[PDB]
Amino acid sequence: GGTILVVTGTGTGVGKTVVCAALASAARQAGIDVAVCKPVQTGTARGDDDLAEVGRLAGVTQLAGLARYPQPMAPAAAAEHAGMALPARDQIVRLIADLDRPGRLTLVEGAGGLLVELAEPGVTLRDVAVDVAAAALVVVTADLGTLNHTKLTLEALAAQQVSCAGLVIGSWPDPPGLVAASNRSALARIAMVRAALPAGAASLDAGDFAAMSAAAFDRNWVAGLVG
Template sequence: MPVMVVTGTGTEVGKTVVTAAVAAAALAAGRSVAVLKPAQTGVAPDEPGDVAEVLRLAGPVTGVELARFPEPLAPATAARRAGRAPVSPEEIERAAAKLAASHDLVLVEGAGGLLVQMDEAGSTLADAARLLDAPVLVVAQAGLGTLNITALTGEALRSRGLRCAGVVIGSWPAAPDLATVCNLADLPEAARAPLLGAVPEGAATLPPGDFRAMSPTWLAPPLSGLWDATHFASQQH
């Protein structure tokens, strides 16, 4: 199935913006795209969530949210505190498979990191990826401290027999420091997977038309983009 799971090395690393960029680049390449958010936490019923943000930035994609819990907590904890049923990996698989039947690409955006618990049984996004037999795209921070958590995420994927599609830096600073520049070479080694892009900080504040036009320049060809890691690194000072 044409499904890709998008996870982060933690919270607030740019996962939703990267999901939107991948969706926009795929749309620009003529592909139909669906975005599935299994569990949206920390958003009130009448507030826009991550799916709405992807649609705002990327354009005409199909957006599906399976559950919403008001408190900004891990999905299992948020569901328990809300007195509602959590989302299981099996539900994610069924929803993604249904979308894959009518779309060229389905992006499943997780909550937080790979091993955040989805339900009381301890299920995680990794379990959903295994059921879907889908590659996992890892969104990482740019600067100091990112190598360890990226390496741990890669190790967790490999130990479960899952394929890391690659790493995208979720927010590349306008003035990168030495550690950040060095991470361009070190992140692929840490993840044991290719570096597939770098989305500039503040990308979400661009007018949606500009975001859509620029997205392919932030992502490598496997993500329907034009970005080249070697050329990008040569431009950093």
Template sequence: MILVVTGTGTGVGKTIVTAALAAAAAARGERVAVLKPAQTGVADGEPGDAATVARLVPGTTARELARYPDPLAPATAARRAGAKPVEPGEAADAAAALAADHDLVLVEGAGGLLVRLSDDGTLADVAALLDAPVLVVAAAGLGTLNATELTVEALRRRGLTCPGVVVGSWPAEPDLAARCNLADLPATSGVPLLGALPEGAGALAPERFAVIARHSVAPELGGGWQTPGP
């Protein structure tokens, strides 16, 4: 299976959610790969997002197609670096190749759904080429309802399947907006809420992260998380 992971924007917790999905699958004995088509804002030799997933979930195959030093949209970062951008077809081919010998391939985007990988291509185009579902990672607090609904609406317009939304970083002390959003996110987006990762989870050791991951994603994603009641 191939699952594309996108966010409502940058910094919402896509990488940690991707790691949680990998951990849940690994706990079932599945072979997992994570593909980062374009990594930006990371220098050569520094760990990128795919390496972070592999650190949190040992045994995960990590692949990165390109990296660019500037913390910008991939197409812009590639242009500034004088480097070739990653085209959607290239990313789709890489994901399909990984799927040949892995049970689950997680394709993590950069920023939001329509951020440009190349001048003419986005993560949505990668998902369309793969005919893969797209999981949306959202922020917890004020403003997330609009951004999430826009992302899900963009997926629907393109005929892409969205299994649900996961909150990428749930605060230790959630404010009123965050608490209300647990009920409002599925109501406004039209897709289920499938989990919430606690803030700081990415700093945990792999053994502890595996436990947290199982409790932070819903059964549909291989975990045991349940939507809180009213």
């Protein structure tokens, strides 16, 4: 098959959706075919739709969803509130496998955190990554407390032998404060920092976003993602 990458965050609201789009844009521009998969989407009643956002910002059209829940809560609670159930583990793995093919980069966007329950019982994005032999791209902040959260996530990945594809600082302030710069240097000693996306990237139009995305990642790294 191709290259499957799960995109997860140290926490909720760290810019993970925008990272998926930036990476998708950079990969499309290197001539890589990109599919983006969101197995579990919550907060639809509030208008949350990360697949749609990825399409808006990066012009990706191969966008695969599965479970959508109205309330902006953790999937287990959002499902319970709507009188629905969570998807089965193999339903998630099947959705990803249908997209996977040679020369394609498939991004699997988690639902707010590596150990959030996506399927019963206690099945997480980490178990999914094991099933489909995916590495994990970890989206992080530059603020106080990021080093603990990142190290917590990276330890959890290694515990099931899920390779870490690297870190992305989801939102990098201009200008960088004293705390941010120090945290960035510390983040780079823990794992590779593939990119630090400028804040407000979600406001750029299709041209500026594509340009932002192209400059943000190392070309050699993106091209090296799929044969």
